[model samples]
Target: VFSKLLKVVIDEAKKFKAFKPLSKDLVSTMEILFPLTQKIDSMQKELDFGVKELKELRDTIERADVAVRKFPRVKWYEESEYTEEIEEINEDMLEFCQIDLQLLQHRN
Candidate 1:
């Protein structure tokens, strides 16, 4: 009997008995809770692994070259679109875009 009591005291620790007070209900409750707590711990470990993999994927995209190329005619269309809009812009803000034909002369 004393051995059983000593085992309970050692296994449950001081706080569990103090909290349970009237009986061994706390220990019984912990038996049900322990497996659930372990499952949550395992899920958190997997979530951490997934987050690390996502960061590696984002870093790979950030370092990529990502080049785009088009014909000179396409470039001409791009400039025309900008120039048509620039002509109507307020004069105070017109200086934001320098309209130099010598720079645009390279277009064929």
Candidate 2:
């Protein structure tokens, strides 16, 4: 019984020794990557800020469209169909920008 207990204790000690080196390696790798992680987080925040600015630009463009539509007379050849198509194009562009922003946010 004494021999068996000694063998088990030796085996456990070996396992513990193995884990110590593994933990050290993991800690060192994390230390090396810490700066990279912070830079990635910083760039992500910048992207979010750019997206916010894009949203503001979209709102301003829509407001401008509203004012244009309110005009009693536009240019000589500005038909309603053309105006509708332009508005649709603007909407599509805005949706694309939103999707791109979402994709950027997902990449964190």
Candidate 3:
């Protein structure tokens, strides 16, 4: 998604000499990417389902429907320095992609 959008912006930039028109390599890369993106979306949905189930189990136990309250198990990596690094990466990426899109501006 990002790769294609970037190429579009760069293609526009090419009109003003700020960028070169994208290469045939990009086309080949996206050919491989289309199927991979579909797989990623499918896996992401499955991961979301697994996370929701864990939360539901925790809530059900906490509500006294089960014999005792239970806690969700955290992965060892979540407790390590890698988690902090991942958080920083996430923040940076979010900022990097931030776009202040606007609606139409009315003129008098």
Highest TM-score model number: 2
**Best model number under lDDT:** 2
Q: Tell me the lDDT of model 1 at 28.
A: 44
lDDT of 2 by residue, 1-108 (tens): 122322332233233234332123322333333343344345555455345644554453344344334333445476565455545534543443333434556643
TM-score of 2: 0.27
lDDT tens digits by residue: candidate 1, 20-70: 321243234333333433343444433332344324423322221110011
Please, what is the whole-model Cα lDDT of each candidate in the order they appear? 0.30, 0.39, 0.31
**Candidate 3 all-Cα RMSD:** 20.9
Please give the lDDT score for candidate 1.
Answer: 0.30
Better of 2 and 3 by lDDT: 2
Put the candidates in lDDT order, highest first. 2, 3, 1
Task: State each model's C-alpha RMSD to the native.
Answer: 33.9, 28.4, 20.9
Please identify model 3 stretches exceeding 4 Å from their true place. 1-21, 48-108
Off by over 4 Å in 2: 1-47, 51-71, 80-91, 94-101
